[PDB]
């Protein structure tokens, strides 16, 4: 029986784990604990659309994590994008000096070794929806009162905006380039999975 | 503002969204309560492949062809889907992954992604085109594995609407049978029907065989009269396989070889080299034998050996040195007989040992005298002052400290096995 | 002899079906099946006649796949076929109902865009599928332009009316000059007027300034 | 030919060929149809996008576009009128003259008049500015009679 | 044999007159007299060809009662007649005067509604019988409604 | 590159003949040192003009 069903898209992920989670005592472990990668176009040469060189077309159905293999050398795949976002009215801020504080509480303790604000800045990246697009870069560095205490169930984050910064505005699909069903401002935080702290 | 996510009767006025590698998901909406929320999506150990399908309907059948490059897997892994393990399949509905039901999979000829074959299924009712974790407009199907990434073969492609067909033997000459029908020879039906916009033939045809020639008839009869269909010595093993398995180009029997020894009595190793003439598919610088053939060969011989002996069948795991030389004293032209053209010819001469191709020289594994003759024979050459072909000690990709072939060898293989001396 | 004596000839006109509009050799031909010969295979390439055609000009419409057409043959040769026109039937109804009065004529496309001429009422109407239209109506004595968003402009016996669904912006690089017997400006919230080089309100009779509070400088 | 007589010939239609190309490129999708004359005046129907466009060789055009939800009228001198989701916009390349033999009535929530040089208003039988809240008159100098 | 050997055949193309536009069996046929056979009776039902036609689409114009048309015959059978087009003559003049310059083209209906394309001046004008008009004129650089 | 020139029958511009080559990958139509819209190829000499 013939019809019109066609294959449109091919994508892939891989999560490889070397170290059991129970051995993570601090974010900056001496050893890598695992690797996570993705291919937005699984059947392209670099995973992103580059044509295969004339001589051969071959690809791994579930990606790859090493560059040099049994016979050749491949371009690295980009690492997986992971994170979350928060949306609420209190972010409607148009002028003056703005100071934003976030506190997070869980059922279980977080770690035997608490963490400095400089550790968190190696693990995460935070962006806001503003007047000209996303507010990002140096203005969104975590401040010194952020951190995790050692036996605590609570994580604390801290951000500030200069009086010279653009206003924080409600999300617009035509301005912030997305598809969220949100009528408030967004605060977006992504993990720097490229780094050991982010992955951990 | 302060929000207890577990408390009823509270103005939990916040929206929570998870960010995922290829999309997003709304988790918590204003006014909701929950008992278990996380800041991040949960990705467990393993690998995942997503296939998006266009223009289907919720009760139709889909037939998919998975074309693999057979043999292109890592031979040195101990976790290899033993017992009844296999690759799992699921479909997407309302941002959730769901198992297929027993009546929804019709057939699966490729349970562990090692060989080419068909997959056929119907689109399930409640399949959804409107989703957020993966782009909308497609039906989505997921395949998954928890094993190292190389335990499966590499892919060439995936095609919908595949149909299998076969040559009809009539009173004509099946010349295309020795080497099969080439890719893209077929484009039409006998009666061109109106509703068919089109037909494609991507890969070469396979599994055919022409009638025996007189030369083969005499060759086959003469050998049976000598070896008596028993696998006892070297010649016996090598000729039994070339007669039995038509798509083996070279064979080598190793008298005392085990994976950890070249002096163990009571065992044997056989090395198989394929032809790979249809380079449109095959990797001609890493030719390999698939598991089907490696196992069939072992079974065939072990029945003919002796009650006490089992043989092992492996791939050669090729490794080799390569040439450099003094510039030719003459050439037809800088372009017509460019050094690059000479390099291509040199590669072909060596490739013919590694994989089937034409070559006048008896072997790639030879002294410079043979190489010199091969070049001297060219219509666009006159002389070359010097040449050498040591192993690539400077090959960065394969780790450094690699052995070199500098000590006046006539391109000897690096080893009894796990060597080829056929770089190209 | 028929078809120069080189082949069996085909007499009269015949009916065929369209199977392919993309000509592999660039001669603007279309592929057509002829059911009295064979109604299962692909068919042959035919030339199409148009009411107007020339070098980069003309009136171009092409049949859809599976449309029914009438075909002629040059020198009665079966492989010199020409498409002369398209046919209607009960399986493919005519969008304009037949009548001996013959009052309605026009063009209607696949997507629903219309252009209709009504002789009885002297009306020309151009209209797209989601309400964007222009109408010239001699039975009203008016011209109407209207969009799908509720914006509308009408010229008729009562003068010119413009209405906006949301807002209205009038701009010029030069001067703006308004004239009439009586000029009436109203706002339901606020009224403002400015001039960077001054402003003036004047009359030959009585000037009036009123409010619950009047402030001057 | 009527009754197959060589001198009762009838012209039935015109033909295209590679020597006289068809202005609309062939496709099995058949999305574009229309009229194009010798001088370049076009009238084109786009089914895919539900668009009707009428246009002359030097930029005078009228477009009805359901993929925009709008109507545009534009000339070669830079004058333009657009009706769309944001209301009605008119722009003039040089000037604008609105006249009536009767009354002119403007209405809206907020009426804003600006001039970059001067603003004037007159009435031969009087003029009035009024409001229910606060009237304001300001300038660097205010003169009354 | 001609017309399958079942009837006398009729060769070539013939001229007829329209007598009835309402088809009793719904096939969109029109009734036409053929004067070389009989110029007094009612005539026979013929199929009409159109420049564009399909399922609920096309360009539709029909002849008026007593218009002159050109008729072809399928398989040369006198009762498989097809109308191919309409004719002009001195008894029914062409509204646009002939010229080797060929500057004027267009549509003009029964009631006087016109749509005319002037190539010489690049002008498109749409006009009804009592003065309602829209003009696009490149020789003026203007648009008038 | 070596595989991009197929033949050159006119190496010193002294006799009539055929030059044949393939357009290289990464050839660019959008440049500013020479007008855009064209692929551009350069020939050069360091000898007197005659």
Residue numbers in the entry:
A (entry chain H): 201 to 400
B (entry chain H): 601 to 1024
C (entry chain q): 365 to 581
D (entry chain r): 437 to 581
E (entry chain s): 365 to 509
F (entry chain I): 701 to 750
Per the authors:
Their conserved modules include an inner tube, a contractile sheath and a baseplate complex.
The spike is located below the tube initiator complex and comprises three intertwined copies of Alg8. The gp27-like domain is followed by the mid β-barrel domain and C-terminal gp5-C-like domain, which are homologous to T4 gp5. Intriguingly, the gp5-C-like and mid β-barrel domains in Alg8 twist an additional 120° around the central axis and are much longer when superposing the gp27-like domains against homologues in PVC/AFP. Interestingly, our symmetry-relaxed map showed an additional prominent density plugged into the tube-exposed cavity of the spike. Alg6 includes an N-terminal single strand and a C-terminal α-helix, which are linked by a flexible loop.
